Amino acid sequence: SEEYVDLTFKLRGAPIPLDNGYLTYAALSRICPPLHELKSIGIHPIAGIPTRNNLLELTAQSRLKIRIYHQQIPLIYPYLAGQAFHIGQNFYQLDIPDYKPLISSESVYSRLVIIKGFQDSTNFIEAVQRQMDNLGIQGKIELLTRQDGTPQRRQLTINKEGKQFKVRGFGVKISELNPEDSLTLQEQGIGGKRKMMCGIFVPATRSKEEEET
RNA sequence: UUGCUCAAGAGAAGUCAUUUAAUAAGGCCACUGUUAAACGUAGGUGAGUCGUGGCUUUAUGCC
Numbered sequence: 001s002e003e004y005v006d007l008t009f010k011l012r013g014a015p016i017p018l019d020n021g022y023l024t025y026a027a028l029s030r031i032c033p034p035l036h037e038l039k040s041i042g043i044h045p046i047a048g049i050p051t052r053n054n055l056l057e058l059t060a061q062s063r064l065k066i067r068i069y070h071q072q073i074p075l076i077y078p079y080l081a082g083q084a085f086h087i088g089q090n091f092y093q094l095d096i097p098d099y100k101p102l103i104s105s106e107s108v109y110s111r112l113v114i115i116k117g118f119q120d121s122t123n124f125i126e127a128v129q130r131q132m133d134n135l136g137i138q139g140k141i142e143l144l145t146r147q148d149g150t151p152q153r154r155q156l157t158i159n160k161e162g163k164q165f166k167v168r169g170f171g172v173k174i175s176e177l178n179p180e181d182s183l184t185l186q187e188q189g190i191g192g193k194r195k196m197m198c199g200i201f202v203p204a205t206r207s208k209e210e211e212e213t
Numbered sequence: 214u215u216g217c218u219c220a221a222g223a224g225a226a227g228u229c230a231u232u233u234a235a236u237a238a239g240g241c242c243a244c245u246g247u248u249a250a251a252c253g254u255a256g257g258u259g260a261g262u263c264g265u266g267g268c269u270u271u272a273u274g275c276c
Binding site for chain 2 (some may be wrong): 018019022028039044045047048049050054056059060061062111115116117119127130131139146152154155158160161165166167168171191193195196204205207209210212213
């Protein structure tokens, strides 16, 4: 539980696209070299009130949250404490960070998970189950659905070099974990693209938040 | 030159021989340094798009 920490920063600035994974990751790596080589690090989605043009308006509860092992914080704290970064032509500022624990919950949820070479929902469930066994985890797999009930896919736009690649993923909800296995899931996660702002798992209330709108 | 003129109280000697201020005594018997306290201000919850390329052994990860 407390053996892993979620670094939270009060984030303020211009409104941000809702598929801003690579943008914020690249900006952070620009203002933090060691972030580009760490392994067990991941970033929580940035909350807020969205807009009509697929952009998110940052609010008071909007904050940049980073999942990290407690034995690697001193490699990231110098480059982010009070620091500011630019996403394109927009200015973003981070305050003094605060530490939040990894709490267990009965059910978990992930906004976007991607595993290479899996586009259909059924094989995605099978692959998430395979990674699920690889971690010694027990639970049941469900996919978050749209208003239509269709499983909801989310897309990440990595704008590497001149080109840009498309990676599509699903929202995965897993329940009945038992708190120890729940903590293992939130800390490991599924998908691997945790630096890419996808694989972090969260308690199940945010799943309802995303399913309402 | 003065009721004066001159004028030694002088020579010599143990204050000595001997003695316990001693014999006996509790400064004792009873006591909580106790009952209470953050190294600590604190500023809170909201999200949508469709089908994959450069590295890596399929898988799976990095961009």
